[PDB]
Paper text:
Pfs25 is expressed on the surface of zygotes and ookinetes and plays a role in ookinete survival in the mosquito midgut, traversal through the midgut epithelium, and oocyst maturation.
Rather, our findings revealed additional epitopes that create Site 4 and Site 5 as targets of transmission-reducing antibodies. The majority of this BSA was contributed by the heavy chain (594 Å2), while the light chain buried 171 Å2. The heavy chain formed eight hydrogen bonds while the light chain formed seven hydrogen bonds and four salt bridges. The complex was also stabilized by extensive hydrophobic interactions. The majority of Pfs25 polymorphisms lie within Site 1, while Site 4 and Site 5 are unaffected by common polymorphisms.
Author numbering:
A (entry chain H): 1 to 119, 140 to 256
B (entry chain A): 1 to 162
Write the structure that this text describes.
């Protein structure tokens, strides 16, 4: 079914260029926004760029403004990312991510390719959380009061793997959208500025880094923000 | 599927070398294979789930804040700003158009050619071979007759039966 496969990663010297690709299969390529997201060693997710489903808009992160260029060859069903003037700051695993048909959530992710360059706050998560086997755990994601009505996305990143979409939760604790293959043990809640992801009957496979995210489309400018990620350890 | 007896709501039947389909009247758009309706000009909260083009509807996009976009229905992909079946994404036909074929165990795209052209077995069944197609449309008696215009057959009004 839905598949995203990245290509073009490798080692590059600071100052040179590199082009990444993402061959998409299993869905209507023209009906989905496509994004690039990077993750540096030991850190959380970092949104890079997005391109509109029909191709009318392109948005970029400030750290890559003027150096990276996102593109799509709608015919070949391929997403490109041209990277010029590379820096050691750009060392990361790059994922191509697909947005849902009817939401800003990144509901499908590629496995990532490694790039090594060598020669106001919206969202907040606690750095870690723990729980014993079979118990219940609630993960917290806290918004600023200026964005009290925002919906947030939750993502699960198993150790050694790339992230996957879990659920989007809005005000009132309403499930706005849900990812594929999510077990019933996972639920969401809300309270004021807080958004929660809850897990009951915790398993060893729930040991993961859970990431909070949200889109921000003010005016004619788009930005996707990520929290720091909550690393969950399962005891027992 | 669309046959010679199919009635097109606010449309009319047309014929190519390998299939029949409904074509909309005036400035209407297809909502399904046999129904034409007025298109909305702007997608917003008041026009959600209304047609905005051939096999396209306005979609509520959940976000911060909510937005609205015109997107192709399930099973269609937007190619050059035209919704076509997903199986026709990379099909090039030339003097024809790609349609969905359901005769094989898996869905495929096949070329249906303009009147006067037929699939060319020596060219991957593209519409690059000259051939004849008999009009199968059943037009009104005494008032209409089948004629080929712009590569398709359609019922045309006779002279004086305006
Ligand atoms: C949140 O902010 C204001 C509240 O007045 C509103 O215009 C905006 O659309 C709201 N967004 C969502 C996603 O609820």
């Amino acid at each position: 079914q839905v598949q995203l496969v990245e290509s073009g990663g490798g080692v590059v010297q600071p100052g040179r260029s590199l082009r990444l690709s993402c061959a998409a299969s299993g869905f209507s390529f023209g009906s989905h926004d496509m994004s690039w997201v990077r993750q540096a060693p030991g850190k959380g997710l970092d949104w890079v760029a997005v391109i509109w489903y029909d191709g009318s808009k392109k948005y970029y992160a400030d750290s890559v403004k003027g150096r990276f260029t996102i593109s799509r060859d709608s015919s070949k069903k391929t997403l490109y990312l041209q990277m010029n003037t590379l820096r050691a700051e750009d060392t990361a695993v790059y994922y191509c991510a697909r947005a849902a048909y009817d939401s800003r959530s990144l509901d499908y992710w590629g496995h990532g390719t490694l790039v090594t360059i060598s020669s106001q706050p919206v969202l907040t998560q606690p750095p870690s959380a723990s729980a014993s086997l079979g118990a219940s755990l609630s993960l917290t994601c806290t918004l600023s009061s200026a964005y009290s009505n925002y919906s947030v996305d939750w993502y699960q990143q198993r150790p050694g793997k790339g992230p996957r979409f879990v659920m989007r939760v809005g005000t009132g604790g309403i499930v706005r959208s849900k990812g594929d293959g999510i077990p019933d043990r996972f639920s969401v809640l809300a309270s004021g500025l807080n958004r929660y992801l809850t897990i009951q009957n915790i398993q060893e496979e729930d040991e993961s880094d859970y990431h909070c995210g949200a889109d921000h489309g003010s005016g004619s400018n788009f930005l996707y923000v990520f929290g720091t990620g909550t690393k969950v350890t399962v005891l027992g | 599927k669309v046959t010679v007896d199919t009635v097109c709501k606010r449309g009319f039947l047309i014929q190519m070398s390998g299939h029949l389909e409904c074509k909309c009247e005036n400035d209407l758009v297809l909502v399904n294979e046999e129904t034409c309706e007025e298109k909305v000009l702007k997608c917003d909260e008041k026009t959600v789930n209304k047609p905005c083009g051939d096999f396209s509807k306005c979609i509520k996009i959940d976000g911060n804040p909510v937005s609205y976009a015109c997107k192709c229905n399930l099973g269609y992909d937007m190619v050059n700003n035209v919704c076509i079946p997903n199986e026709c994404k990379q099909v090039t036909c030339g003097n024809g158009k790609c349609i969905l074929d359901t005769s094989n165990p898996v869905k495929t795209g096949v070329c249906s050619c303009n009147i006067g052209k037929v699939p060319n077995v020596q060219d991957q069944n593209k519409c690059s071979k000259d051939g004849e197609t008999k009009c199968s449309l059943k037009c009104l008696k005494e008032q209409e007759t089948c004629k080929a215009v712009d590569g398709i057959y359609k019922c045309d009004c006779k002279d004086g039966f305006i």
